[PDB]
Design a protein around this ligand. Structure first.
Ligand code: HEM
Ligand code: HEM
Lengths: 449, 449
């Protein structure tokens, strides 16, 4: 309890912390529920302790803007350091200060609309592979587990977008690439109450990324150095200061994790919503059939034209912002928008909490895509709604993730309809761990149109 | 052995490191001898590993200047972090980056010539107390242990210069202040090969500063908050951003350690030299008697006029630079004077090695004060001779230490002569630990004039 007196001496309200644990025992309902309760009983700002680490939650849109945009380069540059990371300290999302800046600048041209349009034909091919595997489990008449067919699709996209390795993950059970890209809680809570043990784990070459996948990828990069995708865009860039070969492998790993779990979990949440709201699902199929008459193939320009599709994605991401929280480490004693923030505090934006706050959303628990219609979108504050973050360190893959998910949705909805069944968890409950995912896997009935 | 390939891949020569240990086993002859050998068999630049930490030694005067002066604020701002330090991370010599800058700027006016002249009458009073205790152990006809009478004197000065607590440490064996200021290797080598254990020690409130002295000092500061010296100069300053009460206590502790061990060890080395060079001792007494006729009391202006005295101090500090090494942590990938220094390397200036190099000193092992005569002082390079460091982070107490030591020397030499005897270690051997101190304590015969 050496710093458990910081928020009292600053006059900031918060939950009283236990010795050593801080407030971590309040994470037992899940930490998005912890954030809603703290927001409800403390107001606009509050403090709590992850073990000995102080964390200041902020909910004011102006303060969020100072932190994420205004004062990003000078005070709030980095995220908080986590458990044994090893050589993945070079990954863009884990790197810090001038080193992050270099990586951000080197990887920015990789995610432009120009390059994204060149990837559309490639990821559209697996759209069709998805529809192929979907027609099959629809004949079973068995409720389908969406995270499997989506999980496989998301892997197919990422493998072919990051390395050009075209594969059918669902029908090729064990390819050296598909396997290795497949093999990837208590330890996180222990680390959080035992952060002084992270240096011991690092020196012992223990790494929260399974080191066995990482040797395989470096090899594959080598057997692909001379022998359009993210690898070449990064290799051609080497042909600031240029990237290195090992740095190359760290970014790719980050892209798989992003590409795989975020894309597959968001797509599942969407089809849950479309199944439990047949009117929305019907209206979306009518917009799709009108833009793309007679199951025509989706294109970059056609996708950017589907306003209701965009509305459904945005609203799904309001209810389930898969990063849950934004965080920045306070580098130096500062005073933002009337309050003093001392060095070393983690400032956290409770995105999940803000997305479900009645101060800004009417009926926050209701799936209502019309919030994001061109009429009501103007009243939505970009620092309350922050599914991809904001400012210089926001989600670099936002445009790629949106395109990738919409391309799957179009093709899947052109051919099938999705209905609940006796195994569907209605209402959906979220897991209580540290990931935003359903408690029970989403299972739905899939009928061919 | 994760980084033991850095100096090879950079083409920098050095001793081959063992796994885990690096080169620490070479510290067995002492690390000043390690630096002389490395300088002799590698040339101007070399690399070695304190466990896993790489350290680049530089001996070029130009590069030393880029590191200590030119590029201090931007790349080489801090010293290397050491073992459990606790709240002494606020001490000026341990603090880093913008935090060090604030402390440096807040404490600079405390060490000006103006304030130093105001301290002279105070520290001259213990000069006389020293002569009193010296006349006594001279009657014993017993060889005198100089570190005792000097150690006590150095404590008397520091206590009365930092807090106004006038005392006779040698004749008042146990005063609460003298005791506490008295109670203050294997663990250092273990830490160096086990740096990942420092966070474990910190969380357990284990601190290499004996925590028992530190609670007493905070109390004393309190019983001195309302109830000319370093404390008031720092308290009056509070009446950048102002200092705090706890920060106050960290700086004072640093001043005691500096004031006590450096002053007492340098004075002993001097009187060893004056005893083993009676001609120098005689000529110095003649300069003293001429400036200060008939044992007149020393003054600020009189001390700054004694050129030979200044010459003896400077030459003693050439042979025994008590900090041994200067160090700076490289904050960012840089290229200085033709060589690339990667982030996180410790750059070390081997002051002891440079002070005894034949490239710049004729007969380096000889005690020859005339090197520093007004004729030959001009040829001495201020980046080879660096007893107090150089640049913005040099010894802030240099003028105070010089005045304090000369005032002791004048008064002691006005009354006594110092001769070797059967117990004097001739030639003097240095200890092989991590401190520059004699192997056997200096003992000399002291005769009244
Ligand atoms: C629905 C899908 C996704 C969502 C909701 C999402 C959301 C986020 C969020 C909220 C952040 C934190 C931004 C901040 O701290 O302000 C982030 C960071 C990041 N995301 Fe995404 N992401 C998704 C998919 C992706 C994809 C597909 C990629 C790349 C292929 C990606 C790459 C990154 C990177 C590199 C960062 C760190 C940026 C930096 O540190 O500069 N994300 N993402
Ligand atoms: C013979 C006596 C002394 C010698 C040879 C000496 C030498 C040194 C050296 C070599 C450094 C390192 C400078 C660098 O890294 O470039 C240093 C730092 C320092 N010394 Fe001294 N010192 C002595 C006495 C003192 C005294 C009496 C005080 C204060 C009362 C003092 C206060 C300091 C401080 C605060 C620093 C750190 C400065 C910073 O980090 O900005 N020293 N000293």
């Amino acid at each position: 309890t050496h710093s458990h007196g910081l928020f009292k001496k600053l006059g900031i309200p918060g939950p009283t912390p236990l010795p050593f644990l801080g407030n971590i025992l309040s994470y037992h309902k899940g930490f998005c529920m912890f954030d809603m309760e703290c927001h409800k009983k403390y107001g606009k700002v509050w403090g709590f302790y992850d073990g000995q680490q102080p964390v200041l939650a902020i909910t004011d849109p102006d303060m969020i803007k100072t932190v994420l945009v205004k004062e990003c380069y000078s005070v709030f540059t980095n995220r908080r350091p986590f458990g044994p990371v090893g050589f993945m300290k070079s990954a863009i999302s884990i790197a810090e200060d001038e080193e992050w800046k270099r990586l951000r600048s080197l990887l920015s041209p990789t995610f432009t609309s120009g390059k994204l349009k060149e990837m559309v034909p490639i990821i559209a091919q697996y759209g069709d592979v998805l529809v192929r595997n979907l027609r099959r489990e629809a004949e079973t008449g068995k409720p389908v587990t969406l995270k499997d067919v989506f999980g496989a699709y998301s892997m197919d996209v990422i493998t072919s977008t990051s390395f050009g390795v075209n594969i059918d993950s669902l029908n090729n059970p064990q390819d050296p690439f598909v396997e290795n890209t497949k093999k990837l809680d208590p330890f996180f809570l222990s680390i959080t109450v035992f952060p002084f043990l992270i240096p011991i784990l690092e020196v012992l070459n223990i790494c929260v990324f399974p080191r066995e996948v990482t040797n395989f990828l470096r090899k594959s990069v080598k057997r692909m150095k001379e022998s359009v995708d993210f690898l070449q865009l990064m290799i051609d860039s080497q042909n600031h200061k240029a990237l290195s070969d090992l740095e190359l492998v760290a970014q790719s790993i980050i892209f798989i994790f992003a590409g795989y779990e975020t894309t597959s979990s968001v797509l599942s949440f969407i089809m849950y919503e479309l199944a439990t709201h047949p009117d929305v699902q019907q209206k979306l199929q009518e917009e799709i059939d009108a833009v793309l008459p007679n199951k025509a193939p989706p294109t970059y320009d056609t996708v950017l034209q589907m306003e209701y599709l965009d509305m459904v994605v945005n609203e799904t991401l309001r209810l389930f912002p898969i990063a849950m929280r934004l965080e920045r480490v306070c580098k130096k004693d500062v005073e933002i928008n009337g309050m003093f923030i001392p060095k070393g505090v983690v400032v956290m934006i409770p995105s999940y909490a803000l997305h479900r706050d009645p101060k800004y959303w009417t009926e926050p628990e209701k799936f209502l895509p019309e919030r994001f219609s061109k009429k009501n979108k103007d009243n939505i504050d970009p620092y309350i709604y922050t599914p991809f973050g904001s400012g210089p360190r926001n989600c670099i893959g936002m445009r790629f993730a949106l395109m990738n998910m919409k391309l799957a949705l179009i093709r899947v909805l052109q051919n099938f309809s999705f209905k609940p069944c006796k195994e569907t968890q209605i209402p959906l409950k979220l897991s209580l761990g540290g990931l935003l995912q359903p408690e029970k896997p989403v299972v739905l009935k899939v009928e061919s149109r």
